[PDB]
């Protein structure tokens, strides 16, 4: 239990190769809950981007 990111250390292991030759300029992500009663809507959660 914590209200924020943990006071510790962890190293990140590699997942993919993907030799993709694309010139990337920007970024956009998304996932939310959408019911069928009141039409398209949104959930209530946040994610971190650094």
């Amino acid at each position: 239990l914590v209200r924020d990111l943990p006071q510790g250390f962890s190293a990140l292991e590699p997942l993919v190769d993907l030799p993709i030759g694309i010139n990337i300029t920007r970024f956009q992500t998304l996932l939310a809950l959408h019911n069928s009663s009141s039409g398209w809507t949104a959930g209530a959660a946040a994610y971190y981007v650094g």
Partner: protein
């Protein structure tokens, strides 16, 4: 053709056997050199090669 993108098409690799406890040359996925290969008592992480 080949201009900028990383190779996506190549031919077969004519590999051979492996000789231990002898002075031999070697080539591990392009990593060339010489010496004697012996059983190690140490471990690599699952994704580490050299």
């Amino acid at each position: 053709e080949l201009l900028h993108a990383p190779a996506t098409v190549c031919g077969p690799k004519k590999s051979t056997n492996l000789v231990k406890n002898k002075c031999v040359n070697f080539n591990f996925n392009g990593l060339t050199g010489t010496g004697v290969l012996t059983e190690s008592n140490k471990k690599f992480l699952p994704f580490q090669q050299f």
